[PDB]
Amino acid sequence: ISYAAYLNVAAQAIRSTELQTASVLNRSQTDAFYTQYKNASEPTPITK
Amino acid sequence: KLQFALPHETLYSEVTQVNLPAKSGRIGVLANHVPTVEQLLPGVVEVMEGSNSKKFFISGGFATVQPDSQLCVTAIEAPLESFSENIKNLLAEAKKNVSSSREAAEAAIQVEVLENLQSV
Amino acid sequence: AEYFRDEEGQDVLLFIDNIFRFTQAGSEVSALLGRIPSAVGYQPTLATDMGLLQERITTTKKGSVTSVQAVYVPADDLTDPAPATTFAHLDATTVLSRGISELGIYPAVDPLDSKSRLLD
Amino acid sequence: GDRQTGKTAVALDTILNQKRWNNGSDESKKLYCVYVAVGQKRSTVAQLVQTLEQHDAMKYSIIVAATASEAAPLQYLAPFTAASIGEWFRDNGKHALIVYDDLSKQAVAYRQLSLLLRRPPGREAYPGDVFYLHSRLLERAAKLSEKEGSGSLTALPVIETQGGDVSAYIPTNVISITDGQIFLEAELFYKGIRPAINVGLSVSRVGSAAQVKALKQVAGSLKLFLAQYREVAAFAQSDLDASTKQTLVRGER
Amino acid sequence: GEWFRDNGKHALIVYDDLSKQAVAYRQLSLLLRRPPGREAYPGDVFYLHSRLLERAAKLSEKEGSGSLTALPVIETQGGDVSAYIPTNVISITDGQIFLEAELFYKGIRPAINVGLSVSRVGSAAQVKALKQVAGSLKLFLAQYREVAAFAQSDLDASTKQTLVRGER
Amino acid sequence: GDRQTGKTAVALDTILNQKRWNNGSDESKKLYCVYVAVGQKRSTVAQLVQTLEQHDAMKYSIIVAATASEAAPLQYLAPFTAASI
Amino acid sequence: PTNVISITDGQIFLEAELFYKGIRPAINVGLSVSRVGSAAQVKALKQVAGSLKLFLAQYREVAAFAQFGSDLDASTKQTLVRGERLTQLLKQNQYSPLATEEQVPLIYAGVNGHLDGIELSRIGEFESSFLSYLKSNHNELLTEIREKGELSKELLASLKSATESFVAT
Amino acid sequence: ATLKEVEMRLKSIKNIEKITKTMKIVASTRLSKAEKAKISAKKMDEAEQLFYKNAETKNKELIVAITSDKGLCGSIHSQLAKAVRRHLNDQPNADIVTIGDKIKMQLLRTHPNNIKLSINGIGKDAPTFQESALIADKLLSVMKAGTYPKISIFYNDPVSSLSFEPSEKPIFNAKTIEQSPSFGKFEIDTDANVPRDLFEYTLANQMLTAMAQGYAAEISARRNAMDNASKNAGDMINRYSILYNRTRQAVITNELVDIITGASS
Amino acid sequence: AAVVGQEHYDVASKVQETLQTYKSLQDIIAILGMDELSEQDKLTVERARKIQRFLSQPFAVAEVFTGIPGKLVRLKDTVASFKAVLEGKYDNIPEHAFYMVGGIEDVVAKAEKLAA
Amino acid sequence: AAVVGQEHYDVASKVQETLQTYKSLQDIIAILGMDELSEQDKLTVERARKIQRFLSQPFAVAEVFTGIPGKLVRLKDTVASFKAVLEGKYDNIPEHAFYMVGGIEDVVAKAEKLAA
């Protein structure tokens, strides 16, 4: 876990009383699949 | 002049007294302070412009007095009132999360946040 | 009109309503007369019938007719023979529009679409 | 070219220009030009006459007239008769010119006549012998041989395209009969090019030899250059390289 | 209808459909070897339709005001207003109401397409009350039509206001 | 389909595969082939007979012909007498 | 054309563009129909070509979507990849008949997706070679396909194995 | 027919125009939000740059690139591809990490060897800290970013609301942070591992900005592109209108001729 | 409704509108894609696709032409079967399980078939 | 192929395929830019645009009128010339170079002329 990942997890936790706007909610959870590659060859996508 | 900024907001982008929670404990900047680079830990932050005082709850970030008297504070999220009961509910969950569980480390971060909440 | 112009000297202006209905009427009379209709079902006497109507109208020494005609273009087609023959006779076009009237302007004349060939 | 782009004026200018040759001596240089007006308003013809008398050019020109008031058979016979007058000049050895404005109205006239003679309609309702009608008219313009006394009779027939339909039956039949085209583009006319000569649809397939050598040398490759300009501005509106820009700057200018 | 009209009363005569009237004249003419015409409809078909449709009249007060309101029905073949029998009738009439199949399918019944419906007499004979409370309605629907295609996300508050009002 | 897109050739392919049954035995498994060419130039026909002779398929083909020059009545009669064959 | 279309039991529409596209015969598969339908084709060939019609139709639909340049998900591109191979499978130069015994394998291969892997350019090479391979090894299998003209369980397995055997070419 | 096939084709062209019009408008709306985000992001970035500038800098290699999955966002994808390719000539030993499908395809084609890490699903929403942080975390773990003695990121700086210039910047290594000329006009703490933290912190803070600059350029490009699309479609409407009109006259005439031929008999 | 009954009418009204919306959206879907329409529309498209292939009800004489066994689905039952789908009572069931099968009962069985 | 030769037929086939593609994407090209074409297609289109221009040969009896001295290129030379072009060997040079000139050799020379 990277330093900014460390901060990230904290920020996400920090978004907990409710009052939480959409931009907060998007900033808290996002969907993406990092597609790792080798040389062409592709270790198949897995959620970021 | 103080700079306080978030990715999604800008808060103060000097300002009389700023009290900051850092790797080096807590650091205070008042007028000119000598130039520092300090990583801000998960935090409770106070900014005072005159006697008027504003209290911020901060997710950690970076602090840098620039040698041109620009206190660059950058952090992911700052109002302390907004953060403040739902968080208590979460804290129960976070204890549960530590029990089962990088996920272990994440739950440890949740414990750090739990401490950070206790200050509030 | 010709009595006014020629024999009372007075310049006159002879309006015609739809000149489409002049054409349309002419087409029918031809068909009734049993003369094979030409392209797009328009009378074989299409050129001549407009020709007689639209050359009587002219500038005499005595007076002059001037004629304002209304052209109900058939299915907004300008390449249809009835419009084509009409445009040959026309010298200027005044292009009233409802957009213009919606800009509160009465005259309703659309300035950018109004064009004359005696604008020369 | 396209209807009422003051089509007549383009030809009229040719008539006017020949006045330093026409008021010139040498009978080859004296063209005597005949303007055949078919299907035209009595007013329009009156303006033409007045214009010719304004440029004092009437004295070297004939006007044959077959206005739209005039009866459809008269209109049919109108180009043929005019061409006879032209042939007298041609066969007088003298050089001449005849501008038949507009043969598109002759087509409408022959159409009327044919239909009223009830011969079944042809394509686009123009009678089936329309090709013969035009061809017999058109080929009576010629540069004769030394035997015939080197006659000339230039011909400019003025075709009125409907809506810029350059595949229309009457125009195509004419295009195939004649050599060269001077297609005039409406879009350019509207976008203030007078005279609007679309070089893309203007050719002279027998013209190049006629050009005087000065105007071959100086004008050398300019047709090519401005047929590079068309291409250049075709693909100008993608990225522009400095080579393209230089051609474009020259071309536009 | 003329008898009622002559008595100075009012009545509404609905000719449904002149398209089949057209076919009958076509049959008569073609069979009587009378000159054929456009779209194989008899040469004088314009004349027939015009005769019928001009009978309808709102009489004068000298003729003790009466009426014979009429509502011709024309069946469009593939929605072709281009077609010869539709074009003629459209020209003769004073207003059109254009029902539209797509709307019918979209469950709007009556399936009148407001855009392609017009009246050239129209609001001249509208109830005063109803006129008052529906000038706005014409404009709103007009806007709703324009903002119709915007119904596919990130939509301006103004457009969204139009959409809510328009859909309802 | 649109004219002379080897229009003749699609059909000719059928004739060629009928070599396989024809070469064999049992006439109920055989198809004898009648190729009728109406309105085609004598040269076109000549190419057809050459191809068929090349693939030795004129060991089972009948060619009924009415070339373009040959009269319009004979052309009209040509499909119907081919049918009789 | 209208009169004849009504009269005939099937229509085999060709398309000029597809001739230029290099599909020879240029049969426009979507416009080509047979109203009387299957009961006049080899039973085996009926089995192999079972979803061949569906696949080609799906390929056509997909192909339209693909040319509107909309992003294509993998499932759509499965169709697309299968579809492309099928198109190349259809092609076959003039004056070259092919016996059912050697059309049954090629269609089996395609429908059972063995062609999907191999590169589009060399599909024609593969086809030529595949037939040669069956002629070499599973010529017994070919004799049976000719003789009984219906793929039995045993034949389906034999054929399946054979295709697999030459699936790496 | 001719007539119906023209008429339907003209309808197709109409529908295409309508969609491109609609899209262009919706794009404008989407662009407004994008720009709003970009301001806040840029302000944050400028503060980070304040450290790096004042410190001075003095920075195989890594390449990071940013595009969206989605197409029809003008020529951002291929102008950027070209400029990546330009700097791929420069260093043959450059390992390309592609953030976005469009750049993924173009570079994957140009060298399929270099693609080592790639992302997906970015473009749906404007860049968020969450995305950047996770990308950073994976960039560090998967690509071991510090090992590359150069890191450079390519993105699109949205030069003007009508222009877009693909732009690149160098992300400053932990090595860079250490020897940066002024580093004595900032109070480093030996006990703290401020380089190993600051490297990570600016890895993300810069990267998020690069993504933000790009995203605004992309949505802007889509607005520009869809505007030009509508124009191109309009021209085709006019061209097919002439075709329709010609065809219409022809149908009337051709039909008429058949009727006449019959009547004549 | 006055003829074939209000229930029959209502079920069919829901089918007709859904399909018509779906046809209208096809042009939009073609270039722009599925993710540019409304959320409601995306569900409507999914439903429409389920309804669209529910119309494929095998013929009993297409055993001969193909092999598909026909399903003679009763009228009362058919009204019921369409209603359920529209109500979203079987919007947990895959789109392809509406294809070439009869009523709702058949769809449930066919759901099991795909499940296995 | 049997007639002119397999090599000729193959060459001609490829020329036809490229050009047919260019015509096919002619719609798409007009509606949206060349940079909105697929990468594979964009190569094809670029080749085809060149091929189209390459095909013009100024005629020797038109030399007076066009003003361009015509060319006559051997058939054996032609098959080769297009063959190279299909493999994109000389493709890397201006479209203007291809336009209105004879053989492959002539194109190469005109590239030098343009290069100056």
Curated annotation (Swiss-Prot), chain B:
Keyword terms, alphabetized: ATP synthesis, CF(1), Hydrogen ion transport, Ion transport, Membrane, Mitochondrion, Mitochondrion inner membrane, Transit peptide, Transport
Main location: mitochondrion
Any one of the GO CC terms: mitochondrion
Highest taxon of source: Eukaryota
Subcellular locations according to the entry: Mitochondrion; Mitochondrion inner membrane
One of the record's GO molecular function terms: proton-transporting ATP synthase activity, rotational mechanism
GO biological process terms on file: proton motive force-driven ATP synthesis
Keyword flag Oxidoreductase: no
Family label: Belongs to the ATPase epsilon chain family.
Role summary: Mitochondrial membrane ATP synthase (F(1)F(0) ATP synthase or Complex V) produces ATP from ADP in the presence of a proton gradient across the membrane which is generated by electron transport complexes of the respiratory chain. F-type ATPases consist of two structural domains, F(1) - containing the extramembraneous catalytic core, and F(0) - containing the membrane proton channel, linked together by a central stalk and a peripheral stalk. During catalysis, ATP turnover in the catalytic domain of F(1) is coupled via a rotary mechanism of the central stalk subunits to proton translocation.
Subunit and partners: F-type ATPases have 2 components, CF(1) - the catalytic core - and CF(0) - the membrane proton channel. CF(1) has five subunits: alpha(3), beta(3), gamma(1), delta(1), epsilon(1). CF(0) has three main subunits: a, b and c.
Record-given protein name: ATP synthase subunit delta, mitochondrial
Originating gene: ATP16
Whole-protein residues included: 33 to 158 of 160
From Swiss-Prot, chain C:
In-chain residues carrying the UniProt-annotated modification Phosphoserine: 101
One Gene Ontology CC term in the entry: mitochondrion
Compartments reported by the entry: Mitochondrion; Mitochondrion inner membrane
GO biological process, one term: proton motive force-driven ATP synthesis
Record keywords: ATP synthesis, ATP-binding, CF(1), Hydrogen ion transport, Ion transport, Membrane, Mitochondrion, Mitochondrion inner membrane, Nucleotide-binding, Phosphoprotein, Transit peptide, Translocase, Transport
A GO molecular function held by the record: ATP binding
This protein's record includes keyword Nucleotide-binding: yes
Superkingdom to which the source organism belongs: Eukaryota
Function: Mitochondrial membrane ATP synthase (F(1)F(0) ATP synthase or Complex V) produces ATP from ADP in the presence of a proton gradient across the membrane which is generated by electron transport complexes of the respiratory chain. F-type ATPases consist of two structural domains, F(1) - containing the extramembraneous catalytic core, and F(0) - containing the membrane proton channel, linked together by a central stalk and a peripheral stalk. During catalysis, ATP synthesis in the catalytic domain of F(1) is coupled via a rotary mechanism of the central stalk subunits to proton translocation.
Subunit annotation: F-type ATPases have 2 components, CF(1) - the catalytic core - and CF(0) - the membrane proton channel. CF(1) has five subunits: alpha(3), beta(3), gamma(1), delta(1), epsilon(1). CF(0) has three main subunits: a, b and c.
Note: Present with 164000 molecules/cell in log phase SD medium.
Family the UniProt entry places it in: Belongs to the ATPase alpha/beta chains family.
From Swiss-Prot, chain G:
CC annotations in GO: cytosol; mitochondrial inner membrane; mitochondrial intermembrane space; mitochondrial nucleoid; mitochondrion; proton-transporting ATP synthase complex
Site residues by UniProt (Required for activity): 32
Localization annotation: Mitochondrion inner membrane
GO biological process, one term: proton motive force-driven ATP synthesis
Cysteines paired by S-S bonds: none
Keywords attached to this entry: ATP synthesis, ATP-binding, CF(1), Hydrogen ion transport, Ion transport, Membrane, Mitochondrion, Mitochondrion inner membrane, Nucleotide-binding, Phosphoprotein, Transit peptide, Transport
GO molecular function terms attached to this record: ADP binding; ATP binding; proton-transporting ATP synthase activity, rotational mechanism
Subunit comment: F-type ATPases have 2 components, CF(1) - the catalytic core - and CF(0) - the membrane proton channel. CF(1) has five subunits: alpha(3), beta(3), gamma(1), delta(1), epsilon(1). CF(0) has three main subunits: a, b and c.
UniProt family annotation: Belongs to the ATPase alpha/beta chains family.
Record-given protein name: ATP synthase subunit alpha, mitochondrial
Organism whose genome encodes this protein: Saccharomyces cerevisiae (strain ATCC 204508 / S288c) (Baker's yeast)
Organism ancestry: Eukaryota, Fungi, Dikarya, Ascomycota, Saccharomycotina
Full-sequence portion shown in this chain: 376 to 544 of 545
From Swiss-Prot, chain H:
Biological processes, Gene Ontology terms: proton motive force-driven ATP synthesis
Membrane topology: Peripheral membrane protein
Coiled coil: none
Keywords attached to this entry: ATP synthesis, CF(1), Hydrogen ion transport, Ion transport, Membrane, Mitochondrion, Mitochondrion inner membrane, Transit peptide, Transport
Subcellular location: Mitochondrion; Mitochondrion inner membrane
A Pfam family recorded for this sequence: ATP-synt
Entry GO MF terms: proton-transporting ATP synthase activity, rotational mechanism
Record-linked InterPro entries: ATP_synth_F1_ATPase_gsu, ATP_synth_F1_gsu, ATP_synth_F1_gsu_CS
UniProt GO cellular component terms: mitochondrial inner membrane; mitochondrion; proton-transporting ATP synthase complex
Listed result of changing residue 163 to I: In strain: D273-10B/A1
Outcome of swapping residue 229 to V: Lower activity
Keyword Ion transport: yes
Source species, domain of life: Eukaryota
Primary subcellular site in the record, as a coarse category: mitochondrion
Function summary: Mitochondrial membrane ATP synthase (F(1)F(0) ATP synthase or Complex V) produces ATP from ADP in the presence of a proton gradient across the membrane which is generated by electron transport complexes of the respiratory chain. F-type ATPases consist of two structural domains, F(1) - containing the extramembraneous catalytic core, and F(0) - containing the membrane proton channel, linked together by a central stalk and a peripheral stalk. During catalysis, ATP synthesis in the catalytic domain of F(1) is coupled via a rotary mechanism of the central stalk subunits to proton translocation.
Additional free-text comment from the UniProt record: Present with 28100 molecules/cell in log phase SD medium.
Family assignment from sequence similarity: Belongs to the ATPase gamma chain family.
